Each structure stands twice: as C-alpha cells, then as structure tokens.
Amino acid sequence: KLFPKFSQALAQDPTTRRIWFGIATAHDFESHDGMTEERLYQKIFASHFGQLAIIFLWTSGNLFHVAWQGNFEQWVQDPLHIRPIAHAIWDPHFGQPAVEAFTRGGASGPVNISTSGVYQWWYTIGLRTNQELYTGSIFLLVLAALFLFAGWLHLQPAFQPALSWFKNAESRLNHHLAGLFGVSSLAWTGHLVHVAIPESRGQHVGWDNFLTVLPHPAGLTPFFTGNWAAYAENPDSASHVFNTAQGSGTAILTFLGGFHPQTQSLWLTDMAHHHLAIAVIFILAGHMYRTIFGIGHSMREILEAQTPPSGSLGAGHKGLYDTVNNSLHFQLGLALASVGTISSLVAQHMYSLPPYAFLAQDFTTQAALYTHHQYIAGFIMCGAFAHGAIFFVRDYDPAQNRGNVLARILDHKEALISHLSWASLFLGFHTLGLYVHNDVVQAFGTPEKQILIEPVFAQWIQAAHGKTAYGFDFLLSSATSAPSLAGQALWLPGWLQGINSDANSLFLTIGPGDFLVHHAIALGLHTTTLILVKGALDARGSKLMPDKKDFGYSFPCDGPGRGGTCDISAWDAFYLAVFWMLNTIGWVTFYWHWKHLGIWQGNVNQFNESSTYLMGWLRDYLWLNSSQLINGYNPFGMNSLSVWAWMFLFGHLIYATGFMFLISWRGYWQELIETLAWAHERTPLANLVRWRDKPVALSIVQARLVGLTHFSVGYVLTYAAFLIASTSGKF
Amino acid sequence: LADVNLVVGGCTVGALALGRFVFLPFHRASLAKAGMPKQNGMTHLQAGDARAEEASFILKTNDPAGFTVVDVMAWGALGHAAAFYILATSSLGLDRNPF
Amino acid sequence: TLWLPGIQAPKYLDGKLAGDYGFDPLGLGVDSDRLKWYAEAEKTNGRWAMAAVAGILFTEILGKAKWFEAGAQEYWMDNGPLLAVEAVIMGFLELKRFQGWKETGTSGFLNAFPFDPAGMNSPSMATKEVKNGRLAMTAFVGFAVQALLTRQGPIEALQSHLSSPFTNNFVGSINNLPNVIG
Amino acid sequence: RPTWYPGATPPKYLDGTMLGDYGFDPLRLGSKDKDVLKYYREGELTNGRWAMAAVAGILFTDLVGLGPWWEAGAKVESSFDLKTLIIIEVVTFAILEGFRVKAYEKTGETGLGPFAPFDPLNMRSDETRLKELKNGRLAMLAFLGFSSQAAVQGKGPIECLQAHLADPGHNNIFTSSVGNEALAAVLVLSITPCLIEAKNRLQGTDEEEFRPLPW
Amino acid sequence: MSAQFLPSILVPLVGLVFPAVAMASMFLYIEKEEI
Amino acid sequence: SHTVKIYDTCIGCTQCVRACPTDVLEMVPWDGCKANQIASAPRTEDCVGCKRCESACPTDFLSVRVYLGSETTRSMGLAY
Amino acid sequence: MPIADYQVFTALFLALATGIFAVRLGVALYK
Ligand code: CLA
Ligand code: CLA
Ligand code: CLA
Ligand code: CLA
Ligand code: CLA
Ligand SMILES: CC1=C(/C=C/C(C)=C\C=C\C(C)=C\C=C\C=C(C)\C=C\C=C(C)\C=C\C2=C(C)CCCC2(C)C)C(C)(C)CCC1
Ligand code: SF4
C-alpha cells in the first residue's frame, strides 16, 4: 500500500493504477512529496553518476564480449573477408539446423554477426589484440565502479554540494569547454599520435613500450621552436596498406583530406590534427566566463546587453539568464535539441565521410549505424520539444519574462502555428500531388509525362564543393577560382578526388527522385515541428481551455463538454508528434537505404527511375528487398536470416498490438474488467484467492503511452530486421 | 621560422604592454559593467557557493594601475598564442594564397 | 609572510596549521572539514614523497638499479604475491591510520595517536614536517618528469647538469630526447 | 571486543549475546528473526562438526602414507555392494538425524541418539561451546582449503605444506592457475573494510530499510 | 571461446533465477503495506 | 478526492447541481449574482470526475471547475 | 590468442564488486 513512497497520493490508490503510475512517475522528482530544490539537484547529480556507470558498463561489456567470443584477431588480419562477431549464442531452444545456421565467422558455436561497427572503430583506434580489449573492459569496469562510488559519495551530507554550486553556470561552462571538451580532445590527439598512428603503420605501441618509442623522429623540438610544419613532412602514400609499414611515413599531423585509398576512410593523421585544433579552440572557449579570478564574462550581463533598440525584440533577452538557470526543463530542452541535432550530424557524416578503417565496405554496418543515429536523433528532438512544453507548463514565469523574446514568441504564437500549418499543407499537397501524378502517368504507360523537377539548387551547392558533374564551374568546381587556388596544396586534391569519385558516399549524384523525397522529408520535419511547437505554445492555455497551465503538462482531457476535448494537453501533442517523427525518420532511412542499395549493387538507375513514383518505392524497394528476409525460415528449412524474419513478424505484431491501445479507448475495457471481476469474485474454487489491488482499465494517458510505446517498438524492430536482413543477406 | 626566442618574447612583451597601457581602461570598464555573475539577483557567492568566492590573491596588488597576476597570465597566454600562430604559419612553405 | 607580497589571506593565518601562507588561489579550504582532511592528506603525501626521495637517493648513491626501472628487476618473490602481501599489510596499516583519524584528528601509526615517542614535538616542528614534505613532493615530481625525458637518475642528472649547465638544462633535454629514446 | 576486522562496527542485532559474535554478517541472512537465526547457528555447528571430522580423517589418512583423500574412493575394496551400502547409510543417517531433529526441537540444541544433551564425560559450559564453534569454523575453512588444493594442485595437504616450505616465494596461492583471481580478491578485500569505515564516517549506522535479501 | 560452461550457467541465472527472484521480490515490496 | 471549485462568475442557474450524478454540488446563499445563489462543493469525496457539471455551465468561461487528482474507490467508480 | 579462464573469472568478480557499488548507489538514491 506504501510502494510509491515518493507520492502518497498514488499510494492511497487501491487499484492497479497505483503501481502503473508508480512505475511511470518515479523519475518526475519535481512532483514528489517533500521535495526541495537542493534535494532535487543532488538526486539529479547522483542519477547522472548512475547513468555514466551504466554507459561505461555497457561499453565494457561490448569489449569483453568481443574479446571473449568475437573474432577480432581474425578480423584484423582479413577485414574484408571476415564477418565481425558480436557475442556467442547460448539458447537452449535452438534446434540443430539453427545451431548450424548461426555458426558463421569461424567460431566454435552459434554467434551473432555484429553490425554495430565496434570492430572497425577499435581497429582504427589502434586496438589489435583481444588482450587489449580485455584490458579496456577491465579498466572501464573499475572506472564505472569509481563513478558509482562518487555517486554514493556526493549524496552524503558531508559531500553534498550546495544548490548555488549547481547553478554556477559560468564555472560549469568554463570547465566543460576547457576540460571536458578541450582536454579530452587533446588527450585523444595524444592517443592517436602515440598509439593509433604507429599501429596504423605496423608499429605496435603499448603501455610497455610507449615511453621508449618516438611518435615523430624530431621529438618535441619542432613543437617548441614553432617549426610545426615538421610534423606534416611525409604523409602516408596512396599505396599505403593499413596495419603494415609498407609505404607509410613519419608525419603525425597531415592535412590531405579525402579518404585513404585502401580503407576508404579518413586519414588518421587528419584526425589527430583535427582533434588538436578542436582541443585548442575548446580550451580557448573554456577561458571565456568569469569565475573567481577577476576576469571573464557574466553571461547575465551579456543577455542584458543583447537588446536591440526601437523595440524590435521587445525587452530583448531581459532575464533569460535566470529563466534558463532556474528551469531544469529549459536546460534539458536545449541539451536534447543540440544532442539530437548532433546525432543527426553524426549520421549524415559517418556514411559520407567514413571515419573508421574498412568502413563503407561493411554495407550492413553503415546502414545500421545511420538508421540507429537517425532514430535516436528523432526521439531526442521530440524529447526536447516535450521538455520545452513542460517548461512552459511548469517553470515559465510571465513576470520575469515580461517583454523578452519568450514573451514575444508567446504573444504571436498563432502566427507561428498558422505558418507552420501553411508550410506543412503546401509540402503535403505538392509532394503528394507530384507523386500521385507520377504514379498515374507511370500506370497509363507514359513515363514521359512525369513531373521531374531537377534539384538545381542542391546540385549548385554540390558544384560549389567541386563536383564537376552538372557543369556549373562555380567555386571549387573551377580550379581558377580563389577558393580552389587557396587550398590547392592543402585539402583540395584529396577532397576533389573524393567528391569526383562515384565509388563513395561523398555527396552522391542527385536527381528528381531525390527532389521529391527531400520535399517528403521537409513535409515530415515541418509537420512534426508544427505538432510539437503547437503543443508547447498552447501548453499554458488555448481558447478551448484557457486554464490549461493549472491542469499540468499531462492529463486525459476536459470532458465531452464544449464540443469535446480529447487529446488537449501538451503531452498529447508530443504523443501525436511521435508518430510523425517515426514517419519522417522512416522516409529518411528508406531514402538512404534505397539509394545506397542502388549504389552498392552498381545500379543507381533502379533508384533513379523508380523513386520518382510510389509504386517503384513499394515494388523495387519494399517488395524486392524483402524476398530473402521472409525466406529466413520456410517449410524447406531455415538459414541465418531466420532471426530477422522472426523479428520482422515480431515488430508487425507489436505494431498492431499498439494499434489496439491506439484505437480502442478506456470504457469498453473498464466494463469488461468489471464483468471479469464479477466472474472471479464468485467462481467456485477460485474465491480462496483475491486481488490485493483492484483490477482497473488502464487510464487514458497511460494507454496512449502504451500504444505509442508498442507502435515505436514495432516500427523500430520491423525496420531494423528488414534493413539488416536485406543488406547482410545480400552483402 | 625566424627564431622562436625573439618572436615569442617580443609577442609576449607586446601583449603585456598593450594589456597594461592600451587595453587596460576598456577592460576595466567592461569588468565594472559586467561585474559579478549574478543568479536570481545576488551573486553566486551570496547564494551559498563558497567555491565562487573571489580569490584574495587578485584583490590587492602593489601595481599602481591594479594589473594583477591573472591579467598578466591572460595577456601572456594571448601573446604566446599569437607568437606560436605566426611561427607555425611561417614554418609551412606552401601556397596558401588564392592566386 | 605570504606567497605574494601585497595580498591578504582569505581564511588562513599563523594561529592555525603548519607551514601556513596565503597560498590557496583556487580556494579549496572553504570547508573546514575539507581543510583539515586536505591537511592530513598533505602530511601523508609529504611523508610518502619524503620516504620515496630518501630511498631513491640512497639507492642511487649505493648503485643498484635506477628508481624508475627497479620494478622490472627480478626479486625473490613474484610481482603478484608481492603486490598481494603489500596490499594486505598496508590495507591493515591504512585502516588503522583512518580509524585513528576517526576519533582524534591527528596522524599516527598502529595504536599510537599521535605516534610521538620520546617527545620532540612542537608547533615549530610541525612547520618543519610540512615544508620538507612540500620540498619532497616537488622533488619527486622533478625526479619523475626528469626520468620521463632523460633516462637517468636524479644524481646522474645533477652531475650532467654540473658538467654543463648551458646545454644540459631542461631545454637541452628536449633536444636530447630524439637521441636518448629510440 | 574483537570483530571480523579491526575496529569494525557490528550490526545492531549482533549485539554480542550469541557465542562467536565477531559482528560479521554483511549479507544479513538472520536479521529480522531470531528462530531462523538459531537455525543458522545449528546449521553452522553441524557443518563445523562434520568438517572437524572430515579434516581429522583427511589429515590422518594423508599422514600415515595412504594416497590422496579424494582418490581414496576407488582405493577401498571390501564386501557389501554399493546399493546395499547406500541403503544402509541412508537408513542409518535417517534414524540418527531424526533423533537429532527431536533433540533440537526439544532442547534447542542438538544431541547424539536418544540423549538430547549427550555428555557422559560432563564438559558442558559456555566457554567450551565457543571453543567448539571456533574450531568448527577453522576446520570448515581448512576443508575448503583442502578441496581447493585438490582442485588446483595435484598434491595432498601435507604435500602442499611441504611444497610451500620448499619455496614459499614461488609456490603459493598467487601463481598462474587461480593466482590472478586470488590477487583480485585480495586487492578488493584489502580495501573494502576501509570502505565500510568510510560509509560509517559519511553515512553512519542508522539502520537502512533494505537488506541484501529482499526484506 | 574459453570457459564454455559459463554461458550455460549464467544464461539460466539471468533468465530464470534472477528474474524470478526479482519479480517475487518486487511483488512482495509493492504490497508491503508498512515498509 | 477530486478538486471541485466554484468561482464568482457563477450566475446561480443550478444546472451544475442538477447535472451531478453523485450529489457533490449544492446551492448556498450568496449576494454576488442576480439569482442570490452560488454553487458549492461540500462532498468532493463523492466526486467521480465525470465533468457533467462543466458540460452544464453556461458561463463563459465555466464557473464549476473540476481538477482530477487523487483516486479512491469512489473516484474510480468501482462496484467491486 | 583468445583470453583465458582466469581473465573471465577475474572480470566476473570485478563485475560483482561494481554490482555491490551499484546497489550501494541505488540504496543511497532511494534514501
Ligand atoms: C574540467 C573539469 C570538469 C570535467 C572534466 C567535468 C566532467 C563531467 N561533468 Mg562536471 N562540473 C565541473 C567540472 C568538470 N566536469 C564544475 C567546475 C562544476 C560546477 C560548476 C561541474 C558540475 C557538473 C554537474 C552538475 C554535472 C556535471 C556532469 C559531468 C559529466 C558529464 C556527462 C558526460 O560524461 O558526458 C560526456 C560529454 C562529452 C564526452 C562531450 C562530447 C561532446 C559531444 C556530445 C559528443 C561528440 C564527441 C565525439 C564526436 C564523440 C565520439 C566518441 C565515439 C567514438 C564513442 C562529465 C564526466 C554531469 C554528470 O554526469 O554528473 C556526474 C552533471 O550532472 N558536472
Ligand atoms: C594530453 C595528451 C598527451 C600526453 C599525456 C602526452 C604524453 C607524452 N608525450 Mg605527447 N603529444 C601530444 C599529446 C600528449 N602527449 C600532442 C597533442 C602532440 C602533437 C601531435 C604530441 C607530440 C609528441 C611528440 C613529438 C613527443 C611526445 C612525447 C611524449 C612523452 C614524453 C613527455 C614529453 O613530451 O615531455 C614533456 C613535455 C613538457 C615538459 C611540456 C608540457 C607542458 C605543456 C606545454 C603545458 C601543459 C598544459 C597541458 C594542457 C597539460 C595537459 C595535462 C594532461 C596530460 C592531462 C609523454 C608520455 C615525446 C616522446 O618521447 O614520446 C614517448 C615526443 O617525442 N608527444
Ligand atoms: C536526457 C533525457 C531525458 C530526461 C532526463 C528526461 C526526464 C524526464 N522526463 Mg522525458 N523525454 C525524453 C528525454 C528525457 N526525459 C525523450 C527523448 C522523450 C521523447 C521520447 C521524452 C518524453 C517525455 C514525456 C512525454 C514526458 C517526459 C517526462 C519526464 C519527467 C518524468 C520522467 C517520468 O515520466 O518517469 C519515468 C519514465 C519512464 C519510466 C519511461 C517509461 C518507459 C517507456 C515509455 C517504455 C520503454 C519500453 C521499452 C523500449 C521496451 C523494450 C522493447 C523490447 C522489449 C522489444 C522527467 C523529469 C514526463 C513529465 O515531464 O511529467 C509531466 C512526461 O510526461 N518525457
Ligand atoms: C496484433 C495486435 C493485437 C493483438 C495481439 C490483440 C490481442 C487481443 N485482443 Mg485486440 N485489437 C487490436 C489488435 C490486437 N489485439 C486492434 C488494432 C483493435 C482495435 C480495433 C483491437 C480491439 C480489441 C477489442 C475490442 C477486444 C480485443 C480483444 C483481444 C484479446 C482477445 C483474447 C485472445 O485473443 O486470446 C489470446 C491472446 C492472444 C492471441 C494474444 C497473443 C498471445 C500469444 C499468441 C500467446 C501468449 C504467449 C506469451 C507471449 C508468452 C509470455 C512471454 C513472457 C516473456 C511475457 C487479445 C489478447 C478482446 C478482449 O478483450 O478479450 C476477449 C476485445 O474485446 N481487441
Ligand atoms: C550492460 C552490458 C552487458 C550486457 C547487455 C550483457 C549481455 C549478456 N551477457 Mg555479459 N558481461 C558484461 C556486460 C554485459 N553483458 C561485462 C562488463 C562482463 C565482464 C564481467 C560480462 C561477462 C559475461 C559473461 C562471462 C557472460 C556474459 C553473458 C551475456 C549474455 C547472457 C547474459 C548472461 O547470462 O550473463 C550474465 C552477465 C553478467 C553476470 C555480468 C553483466 C553485468 C552487467 C554490466 C549488468 C549491467 C546492467 C545495466 C547497466 C542496467 C540494467 C538493469 C539491470 C541491473 C536489471 C548476454 C547477451 C554470457 C554469454 O556469453 O552468453 C553466451 C556469459 O557467460 N557476460
Ligand atoms: C520547445 C521549447 C524549447 C525548445 C526549442 C527547440 C527544440 C529549438 C530548436 C532548434 C534547432 C534544432 C535548431 C537547429 C539549428 C542550427 C542552426 C539554426 C544553424 C546555423 C547556422 C548557419 C548560418 C550555417 C552556415 C553554414 C552552412 C550553411 C554550412 C557550412 C558552414 C556555414 C557556416 C557556411 C525551449 C526549451 C528552448 C524553450 C521552451 C520551448
Ligand atoms: S452551472 Fe455554472 S453558473 Fe450554473 S450554478 Fe453551476 S457553477 Fe453556477
């Protein structure tokens, strides 16, 4: 009866809704009984330590499983003909053909073929042996234990920091930029130069001999005399072979750009140079704000001074420092927005500029990594907007935000929502109309009547990069231009060789189907932003419900009065926008996967004349690439793709089980549960036992969340199964 | 590539001199206007952050213009950054020109 | 006197502690319990560095092997049992030291807190203990960084510097580093 | 009072009224109830007595000149088939331990045969119970040792002692078989009572609600 | 793959033993009434 | 255990009281409106949260506001 | 050269130790 000790209101519920909401309100510390702000922030800090320990344990487990059951030794010697092994399989449900079908990469028993790209990353950063991976796993185990001890320690009242320490923004930014960002990047440069650079050239460097091996034959003296160009003397040749000393070099900070010819990945010396420059700039950035040494910035005064005259922004940024600092939800929204955008950047960059050795030959790994980071980015961006809506519901003070840009953007929120609606409506109308017109003219036997708008602007920017394929001869595509001549002895040769080659993903050739799918992506982003922005801006109140801020961020409705108030809270707007995020990321990853499937087969045409109409999308992509997937098991037997077929049907089942909660609502189920309670309360031989908690139907918000969770899980599992099966079974 | 000693020493001396004689009044005016970083009204120290207390080794100096040790180190760091920038960009012998 | 002729101490003076100047520019003694804990940590680190410097100097005067290479030498018992036996013995000793810190706020050894046999304890003697500790921690950092550049002992470095102070400085060790490491 | 590490803080329920109370129960198996705790004490006493008998038999067998104790199962040739031996052993120990259950449910303590106290020689006192308990604890640790050298090494307990005496610096627990696992356990256990002292210093002994078994 | 027996013990432990004990423990704790 | 509140925009039309299916609302004497009566909620422990009173309030915006809060065996409307 | 039995057992023991650390942190967070 006293299980939700954080919420005595929930503990007095004599139903199963008590435990259901006890699970789901456990991390809403602000809503907990007897919660001060000091205890809030200290709990936040300790939970952060727990999360860091969890992440470190997870990567240590990856290292230990690859070192213990993987084929890292065999993969290092033959990176292009050995399947990386994730972990061994011990499932007593396997029949004998399942045991044979899962024994693949030279292992003793059934194993899972890794698609996470940890093999390429660890091989690139200089890890060569299973002993090194085990040492890394043990070190991460110890450091996660240390972080757990720190989380315990800072909850103790002798070591609990003050609330003002948590809100010390200038110091936290200074140390994060200078130390967490800068010093870490400098240390990664040190690892790359000391370990990864020699291990890329067949020279083993470890803790036993890194103090007796010289990273550059002219040690430190060029660094200290300012002759820094001596660290970029002889780069690795185009004939260089990875992990061997054949045609290597001595330079540690090259600057050639492009890709390594053998690994089809970026130069490691380029990475060391990049990380060193990033470390310098981030340490400088961390020397910006004022702490205790009489120099630096007060960010409050910077926000005060950012008020343009003539009342263009009203009061400008009056009191935004306190608005951000007092609100944990504002900070969490900013952090989630930035982190989701960075995750999208990571997805968009690692496929086109492959960083790790022998990446972009493992086609399943690239597709899986891209789709993973894109889905993570979409979820995190929805979380950013949801926490912005929470900040409007909870932490927004109109008095201290009077005249500043927040009050201005809340003042004319109808214009923002209406213009997002106009943009989404235009994009949906036009993209769907062009697609349906193309479908109809394709069906009627007239492909020449298609509307194929050439993406001339994106092709123009591609030409500005040096892509001499559309004949613009603009900036970098003309060698006579000032940017072309400026770095022609710098990054221009390698970058131009990468940009003019059709064998990589460095800015692929685009056509009308790319135009149509880019407008589809624009429609998805616009509509998801419309739902999320409308939910945030209408979170405090609307015309249908003026006092919405009093009812909280999440609540079922306001009853059937005033015409009906279903899905009126900002939580419901986030709920509706998660579907649109899933649809948008589905479009993005469908586009990426079909384009790269055309590229990897050498048949760019299949996408070029099949993406302009939707029947080509359904038939030449969804229907065609699922043939090996659905034959993972059959009456004639089974093979290694059986797990992805089972996960395919599994995700379909979870998706429709989500539809169950999505369509049916709480009222039929409550009557059914009452009828079954009547049945059990007077069934003979079962009246001996009775429920401690009264069985009730799931609440409206709870079942909306459950249906959304099943929808997302089925979506993700289905697409992951299809993508990994259709790429790994084919390549 | 023209002697690290002379370049670094001259640039550091120049950064210190233009920080002490040239840029000192505007820096002092900016430090007076911005002042303490304040949260919810009062500063970090007045809200309880004992680590955010202004260190006492900068408050009083025997310099007539109040040029503290932290100002000296910041200006020397800026001069060293400029000197190593020009030394490194003179070390390279490649056509970075857009001609 | 303080570490800067022209400043005033933030929260320190000559009435408390030992070897007390105004040196806390980052302000780490703002908590009294943390101040006394850091004082005990400073004393313990100073004592350890002092024993370390004395042992390193005494080993190199008598010869033996270099201090940064003495671990790689072969002894009567393997490194594993040595580490484990040392771990047990000084886990016991450090548990006694920490428990002795738990009641009284002084340092000691075994059941004596403070471990002060035959007297010779004075407030002026406490300033001698800390300052020699500061000197030995700086000396051991010097030994370490010097060994990381030039692979030679502290006495050998001093003799090489006295042979030629112009060329065998710390600047010349950076120049000599491509020659001494291969 | 001596504790399971020097200067340790015993648990609240381990006040000291029970014999052999060194305050060692980090997992807290018998905290909420006393009757179950008395059952744990009875199990400890039974296991310790049977371990004293085991270590006495193994030490005497390994000293006279016979083979290894673990390999002595196949070195016994006599009458009585194994099935008859099993059935007579199970019926004899069923009778004996049923008598033991009756004795424990009567006196609160064990007894051999019908004699619930069982002391023809008369040596029952509070101090000799502590001697028995500590000797049984030591013999249990000794049998755990004996089985461990049987598993790791191929030498008997006296043979293992002679091997240690020949080269104590190269023939011990810390070798290459289980040497690294033992080294890690020694490193962790050499610091963990200091972490208990740290927890007592920073958190205290205010009786937490949860226990390492979920009550 | 060294120590092949270890998955055969650990997988039932985290699939049957630890989950059953955790589910029973949490079921006991959610209806503890007076914690 | 639902929070039901009455506000001064109430005109005393008694429609919220008539709409209530568990007898939570009642009319008490008042002087702030023409009808000389205002609604009151002395029995919010019997409130299920159906918001039928809100559906009957003609004032814009409505004067009988129901805030769903803690759930009991009567707020959940259970017969078992 | 695949890792040995002793390495796996030592890793599992250290994971048990960090599990003790984890439950200590969890208990501190619950209080
Ligand atoms: C130089 C000193 C310093 C350092 C190193 C740190 C470091 C850290 N602090 Mg801290 N802090 C400091 C000073 C410092 N702080 C001060 C002075 C204060 C008081 C004002 C605080 C107050 C404070 C609070 C309140 C909190 C932290 C937290 C954290 C942790 C952040 C979470 C994390 O690990 O993500 C890591 C971040 C990065 C790795 C940056 C990466 C940049 C992007 C996101 C990724 C891109 C990099 C690259 C492309 C990825 C490639 C890797 C891939 C190959 C695997 C982190 C370890 C949080 C925490 O977790 O609690 C323990 C937290 O709650 N700090
Ligand atoms: C933080 C990363 C890091 C670390 C820990 C090291 C560590 C080391 N380097 Mg290395 N290095 C690094 C980055 C790093 N390096 C980078 C970014 C480059 C340029 C690409 C180099 C290029 C380089 C060369 C060419 C050589 C080394 C060498 C060495 C070894 C001898 C020490 C020495 O250089 O003399 C002592 C150094 C000094 C006395 C000057 C240090 C003072 C600086 C300028 C200010 C300190 C501020 C700084 C931010 C502190 C960072 C702290 C951090 C370690 C936590 C040593 C183990 C030498 C060697 O022999 O290899 C074995 C060698 O020849 N390094
Ligand atoms: C740094 C990331 C971060 C952090 C710290 C928070 C923190 C918080 N969020 Mg938030 N959120 C985030 C990201 C984050 N969020 C993201 C990315 C999203 C988009 C998905 C959301 C969307 C969101 C909403 C809509 C709400 C919150 C809420 C909250 C607050 C209470 C949490 C809670 O409800 O209890 C604990 C939360 C849970 C126990 C999550 C439930 C479990 C999920 C739904 C099911 C997972 C099933 C799993 C995937 C199945 C495996 C599949 C396999 C079997 C096949 C809390 C302060 C709530 C709030 O503010 O209260 C008003 C609120 O309603 N968040
Ligand atoms: C594929 C998605 C899906 C699934 C699985 C279900 C499943 C179910 N629906 Mg439903 N429904 C759905 C979609 C779905 N619905 C949608 C989209 C709507 C909107 C129109 C509805 C509307 C609806 C209504 C109105 C009703 C149901 C009812 C039912 C239940 C009928 C009882 C039964 O079938 O016996 C058996 C259960 C199953 C076949 C489900 C799968 C169980 C598997 C096959 C076996 C279990 C083994 C298990 C997985 C092992 C445990 C593993 C452990 C680790 C957890 C059942 C659980 C009715 C009901 O309440 O019960 C009569 C009811 O009236 N549904
Ligand atoms: C979070 C990381 C993680 C994950 C997801 C897994 C997952 C898995 N491990 Mg593994 N393990 C890990 C870390 C991890 N491990 C680490 C760091 C080690 C080094 C000690 C090991 C050592 C290990 C061995 C020896 C074995 C496995 C095995 C397995 C497989 C079956 C589980 C099992 O029976 O073993 C149980 C796992 C353990 C006893 C240790 C795992 C402890 C992790 C770190 C807990 C992390 C929990 C997480 C942070 C929060 C989730 C909440 C949770 C506490 C309820 C399974 C796929 C078995 C296998 O190979 O299958 C074929 C196997 O025998 N693991
Ligand atoms: C709800 C809410 C919230 C949230 C929001 C969000 C989510 C936002 C966002 C957003 C985003 C997500 C954004 C993004 C961005 C970015 C940008 C805006 C940028 C930029 C810039 C530029 C201009 C660039 C340029 C260039 C190019 C183009 C490339 C190359 C280089 C260069 C530089 C040239 C908050 C909490 C706050 C508050 C409350 C409410
Ligand atoms: S329905 Fe509205 S206006 Fe009428 S009595 Fe009730 S609260 Fe007042």
Structural class designation of chain D: mainly alpha
Biggest sheet character of chain A = 2 strands, antiparallel
Multimeric state of these chains? part of a larger assembly
Strand content of chain A: under 5%
Strand order of the largest sheet of chain A: 1-2
Largest inter-chain contact set? A-B, 45 and 45 residues
The percent range for helix content of chain A is 55-70%
**Radius of gyration of chain D, taken over Cα atoms and rounded to an integer in Å:** 22 Å
Strand content of chain D: under 5%
The separation of the N and C termini of chain A measures 56 Å
| Number of DSSP-assigned strands of chain A | 4
Principal-axes shape call of chain D: globular
What is the molecular shape of chain A?
globular
Can you give the helix content of chain D as a percent range?
A: 40-55%
Major sheet summary line of chain D: none
- Number of DSSP helical runs of chain A: 28
Total of DSSP H or I helical runs spanning 4+ residues of chain D? 5
Descriptive tags:
part of a larger assembly, 7 chains, A: 731 residues, mainly alpha, two-stranded antiparallel sheet, two-stranded antiparallel ribbon, 28 helices, 4 strands, 2% strand, G: 31 residues, 1 helix, 84% helix, 0% strand, binds chlorophyll A, binds beta-carotene, binds iron/sulfur cluster, photosynthesis, photosystem I, light stress
Structure, briefly:
By secondary structure, chain D is mostly helical. Chain D is 54% helix and 0% strand. Chain G contains one helix and no strands.
